[PDB]
């Protein structure tokens, strides 16, 4: 999802679907 959830275990494209997953934001395995 081209975002990292590094500082704060919630992304901005979270809320649109993509999940934090190991530091990175990550949708169905999809940067």
């Known amino acids: 999802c081209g975002?990292?959830?590094a500082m704060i275990s919630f992304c901005f494209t979270?809320?649109?679907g993509c999940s934090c997953k190991?530091?990175?934001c990550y949708l169905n395995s999809i940067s």
């Open 22 to 24: 190991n530091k990175v």
């Open 14 to 16: 979270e809320v649109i």
């Open 3 to 5: 975002e990292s959830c």
